Amino acid sequence: QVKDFVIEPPIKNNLHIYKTFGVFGGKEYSANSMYLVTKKGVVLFDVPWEKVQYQSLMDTIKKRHNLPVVAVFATHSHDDRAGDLSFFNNKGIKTYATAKTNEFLKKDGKATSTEIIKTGKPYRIGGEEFVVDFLGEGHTADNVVVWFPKYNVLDGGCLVKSNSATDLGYIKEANVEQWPKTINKLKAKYSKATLIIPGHDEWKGGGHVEHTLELLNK
Numbered sequence: 001q002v003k004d005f006v007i008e009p010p011i012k013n014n015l016h017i018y019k020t021f022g023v024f025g026g027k028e029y030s031a032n033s034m035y036l037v038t039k040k041g042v043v044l045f046d047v048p049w050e051k052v053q054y055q056s057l058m059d060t061i062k063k064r065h066n067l068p069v070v071a072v073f074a075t076h077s078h079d080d081r082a083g084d085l086s087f088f089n090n091k092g093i094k095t096y097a098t099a100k101t102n103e104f105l106k107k108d109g110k111a112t113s114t115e116i117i118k119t120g121k122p123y124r125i126g127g128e129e130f131v132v133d134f135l136g137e138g139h140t141a142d143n144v145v146v147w148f149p150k151y152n153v154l155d156g157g158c159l160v161k162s163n164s165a166t167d168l169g170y171i172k173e174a175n176v177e178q179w180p181k182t183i184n185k186l187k188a189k190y191s192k193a194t195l196i197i198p199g200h201d202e203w204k205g206g207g208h209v210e211h212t213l214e215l216l217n218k
């Protein structure tokens with residue numbers, strides 16, 4: 001498979017945004033994920049959209065950083081997020097999801113995580129720190145965000161729409177009534193965030209939170 005994924009220039013050395021692509025309904029779409037380099041290996045936040053690219057990403061990370069992937073955190077149950085966790089489980093790489101996300105994975109016939117996320121509590125690995133937060137339902141009932149306090153970056157995931165999105169996208173499993181309330185909680189909580197990464201489309205340019213509220217109103 002062609003290496004068409006994009007690893008962006010990192011925030012303060014170790015925090016990386018990476019973009020992967022998938023074709024759905026005759027059109028190519030982008031998903032933004034992240035990874036964090038630590039002294040004990042690399043932590044993925046969500047996985048390539050296409051499972052055929054899992055090994056490719058791991059190989060690229062090994063060549064770039066001389067480090068293995070040592071943990072995978074899913075920000076919800078969908079294919080562009082948790083994906084197929086069996087790939088990582090089979091290799092003995094710890095995978096992390098909330099109880100809710102695991103319930104969805106199991107219901108959908110998919111592999112579940114080997115570790116259970118405690119929301120709102122610091123995770124520390126290889127000298128790095130982050131917090132996985134559940135702010136409420138939105139894009140899905142299980143969507144969570146990831147705060148990186150040393151980087152002032154919030155991984156919004158698919159709860160946050162891109163400034164470049166023209167609709168809400170896949171909403172069959174969304175809680176549209178709760179979504180703006182969850183976004184307003186996010187907006188109030190992460191004032192220190194100088195960068196918020198939306199799950200899909202353009203991550204550059206800011207104004208993602210405000211545009212999410214606009215799309216919800218429309």
Ligand SMILES: [Zn+2]
Pocket residue numbers: 076078139140158
């Ligand atoms: Zn989703």
Ligand SMILES: [Zn+2]
Pocket residue numbers: 031078080158199200
């Ligand atoms: Zn998504």
